[PDB]
Amino acid sequence: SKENLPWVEKYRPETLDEVYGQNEVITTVRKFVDEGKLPHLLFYGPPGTGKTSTIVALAREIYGKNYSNMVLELNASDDRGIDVVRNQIKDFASTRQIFSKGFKLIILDEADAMTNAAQNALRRVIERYTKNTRFCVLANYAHKLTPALLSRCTRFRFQPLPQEAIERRIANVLVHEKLKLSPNAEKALIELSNGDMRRVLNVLQSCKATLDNPDEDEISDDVIYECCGAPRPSDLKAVLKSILEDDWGTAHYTLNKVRSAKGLALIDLIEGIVKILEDYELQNEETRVHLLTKLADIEYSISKGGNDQIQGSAVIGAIKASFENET
Template structure:
């Protein structure tokens, strides 16, 4: 039996296998963890709202907290709902009603309702929710999870104590990453670790997914390299972006366009990622005329916005090249 369980856990994707089982295993969110623990110790848990970018530990923190509060009573005392499931507010209302109104046989205290991905709810649904929250406040606490607080209605916001989950800091990510590397017996060089930290951008889910994919791609005793990390997440290598930028600045439009398309096609890189890397690289450039930088960043951010609305890759590539070329042409005329 226990062997069976162990094997099951082995087969899980690493994001689930390494999901924190207690608040101590939540990395890089110490202030939030300490505050919510204090609420529980004082027996004054308010309705909570956790919001912030993906993979920063919102779901993990509330589940770990609930496990600490309820232990083996978890399933009687906690209701997990996913608001982005294709269900109307009526279903949510009925489930909450059934759950909140059943008697608590096993333990005293509040029941907890976790409402994940609440920013996917319509405004009408959110408005109904605030009634529901009020109605059951006597014996129930809600924890609302969302990526964007601005997508929630003010009425809902004002009923909760808000916590913003920041992207996890590099030191915390590194610590967690090193744990997993040891547990999974992974061979990985330092450059690859650095690359992984860089591509993660504070998202722990991404670290675990890329690490698992890279491990699957190498032989038993082979080392994971920087190249492989970039390959596994379809990100552009810094060297490639330098090549693209050099070509834009030093060659004519057609050559720059050719270089950019070729690299993007070969490495499967998305245009948004190129823009992001180019912006980082450009920060290091000393310009004679600061206006050049302002003009260029404005143009690039417009292009980035346009990509989010859907755009043709080739048109986007031409736009990036034009944006940089025209801005730099102004620079040289001013310099002359």
């Protein structure tokens, strides 16, 4: 019943060739498998980069039918304390293989949430029973892992998804769901994805839901911005132009009108203005400092909440004061 599933858990890759983006890691692990030697892998990267899918497809490729007993997967949902590591992991990586020979695979999903004592006990299991067992460690934060564990694990870095991988996955989704996507909407979707496939899948599902009749109807950038509630680039450019050139009253009026036209959030406008101003050429190096600092505290205050109009006026005043240094 794959039609009764969210799009994120509907297009999970089943084979290694279905994982896009991380070509180097996929080729390296495939060479490892074909050569017959697999070290203690360690997968590191931002969420949604395809670490769990890659390791699951790798385990399926290695053990086609014996995946149930040749693979032991533990994650943050199960207790992974000192006792679990001492007993269950040792018992799994202490017995002989059933009939598949090869080696036993132990996957530690989100190992950054494990305690330090658990990792200290796990390092000796890893370096002791490595003849017949290989460990895989998946984590988004490397600072929460013991340096010895990183030392005994071969580190693989999962980069954020490039453009072409997003295009290929979106094309596959469109072919499967019989959907149409405008190139402008395609560009908008990749920009908001931020190297995340789950965000792309969720936004595509929401856009298909947004259409009154899914077939014979294209998904435009307007549909994307209406479904996800993000400001259009034209709105951001107009707001920045009004703040930079116009006086205070009309800039405030323009910001209020732009925000009230579609119900836009101030934090999204702040992120858009930050992204646009990064492309600007500033010749003072004090405008950069003022902009970054003032916008950082404004974003933090928005994260803690407060008066929204005061925060918007603060954004306008901060930008104006920072650009007064460029004289």
